[PDB]
Amino acid sequence: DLRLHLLLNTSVTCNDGSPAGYYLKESRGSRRWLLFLEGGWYCFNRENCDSRYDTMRRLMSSRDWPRTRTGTGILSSQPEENPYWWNANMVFIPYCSSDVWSGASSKSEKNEYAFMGALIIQEVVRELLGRGLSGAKVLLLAGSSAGGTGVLLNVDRVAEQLEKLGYPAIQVRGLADSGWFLDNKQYRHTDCVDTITCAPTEAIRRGIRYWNGVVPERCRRQFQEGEEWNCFFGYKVYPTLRSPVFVVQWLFDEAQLTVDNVHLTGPVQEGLRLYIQNLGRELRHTLKDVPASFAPACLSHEIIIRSHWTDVQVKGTSLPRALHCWDRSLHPLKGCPVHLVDSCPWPHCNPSCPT
Ligand SMILES: *[C@@H]1O[C@H](CO)[C@@H](O)[C@H](O)[C@H]1NC(C)=O
Numbered sequence: 140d141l142r143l144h145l146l147l148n149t150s151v152t153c154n155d156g157s158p159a160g161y162y163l164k165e166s167r168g169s170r171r172w173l174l175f176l177e178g179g180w181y182c183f184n185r186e187n188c189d190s191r192y193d194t195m196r197r198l199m200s201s202r203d204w205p206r207t208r209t210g211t212g213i214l215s216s217q218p219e220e221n222p223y224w225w226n227a228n229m230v231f232i233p234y235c236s237s238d239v240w241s242g243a244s245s246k247s248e249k250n251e252y253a254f255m256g257a258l259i260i261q262e263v264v265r266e267l268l269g270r271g272l273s274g275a276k277v278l279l280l281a282g283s284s285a286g287g288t289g290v291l292l293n294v295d296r297v298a299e300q301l302e303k304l305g306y307p308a309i310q311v312r313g314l315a316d317s318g319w320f321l322d323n324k325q326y327r328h329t330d331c332v333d334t335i336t337c338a339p340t341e342a343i344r345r346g347i348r349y350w351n352g353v354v355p356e357r358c359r360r361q362f363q364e365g366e367e368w369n370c371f372f373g374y375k376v377y378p379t380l381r382s383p384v385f386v387v388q389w390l391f392d393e394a395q396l397t398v399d400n401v402h403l404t405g406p407v408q409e410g411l412r413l414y415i416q417n418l419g420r421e422l423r424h425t426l427k428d429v430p431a432s433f434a435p436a437c438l439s440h441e442i443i444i445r446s447h448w449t450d451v452q453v454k455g456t457s458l459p460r461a462l463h464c465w466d467r468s469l470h471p472l473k474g475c476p477v478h479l480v481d482s483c484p485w486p487h488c489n490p491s492c493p494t
């Protein structure tokens with residue numbers, strides 16, 4: 140179990156002004172630290188944030204959080220469940236800012252909600268340095284879904300923060316799971332006039348304004364004002380980064396298909412067959428020059444904190460093994476690969492896909 144700590148700096152808050160926080164399980168014999176970012180979509184105006192507050196309030200507030208949480212998958216402390224980092228110090232950071240971890244705005248007489256995701260990460264790092272993180276050799280910033288995108292947006296800022304604080308020896312790295320999206324054409328079109336129909340590019344453009352969103356400096360300097368939404372898309376922001384980042388991405392991610400207005404129920408036809416095959420090929424193409432990556436040909440969503448994350452394989456190598464091979468490479472290795480991308484072109488052409 141991981142134990143809840145609410146942030147001592149009460150100005151760093153969830154959407155509704157309640158304190159943000161983190162769940163921690165220490166491993167005093169270890170100098171490895173894993174900080175995991177939860178996911179769960181986002182909201183981008185008053186009306187759709189109000190809806191989220193009625194029926195998704197744990198993603199908006201800490202007032203009902205439980206005192207503990209069980210570590211699962213890569214957050215498990217049992218070697219049978221977590222062959223990769225079972226002995227590390229474990230941290231789970233709840234997603235309560237609805238801003239893809241990019242916001243830097245407080246609640247005020249001008250703002251009904253606070254959007255502080257980027258500041259929550261920095262405050263968690265600061266308060267952990269007093270609880271053992273000061274002695275770390277590696278800090279791995281991981282996350283799933285919106286948390287995976289959050290890794291891409293924040294990993295270099297964590298690195299810069301520790302450097303300026305006097306800790307140049309801590310190696311910051313990132314692990315982005317199911318957060319690598321494409322700004323592609325939808326299979327069927329919908330005009331952005333309310334939430335249902337509003338494509339990611341437009342929703343994120345409005346979000347950055349609503350959230351006072353922050354993106355990495357180098358990417359911001361390339362795309363410039365009004366175009367920072369580009370930095371929320373992995374294939375555009377990744378080349379600007381400097382911290383080592385391992386990318387885990389299903390070729391046919393269910394959230395990607397949702398934003399593309401694809402609904403698979405049933406006998407496809409030719410038009411949709413070609414659309415799905417082209418999506419797989421495009422994703423594959425964006426990963427061609429990503430040296431640490433794991434991309435199976437499955438229709439699924441998230442993986443690294445699922446209890447059965449050990450079961451999927453690409454070219455005979457599991458995800459925990461590929462992550463271990465990555466660790467070795469950061470000290471090619473014979474029989475210990477780090478770049479693993481399926482080539483077959485249809486969902487579940489890989490027999491190890493989740494059922
Ligand atoms: C609390 O957090 C805010 C927002 O990041 C920051 O400006 C302030 O300096 C912090 N205060 C302390 C005492 O850490």
Ligand SMILES: OCc1cn(-c2ccc(Cl)cc2)nn1
Pocket residue numbers: 178179180181239284285288320339343371372394
């Ligand atoms: O949990 C599903 C999910 C998807 N997203 C998301 C994030 C960024 C972009 Cl650019 C598109 C989609 N966030 N959460």
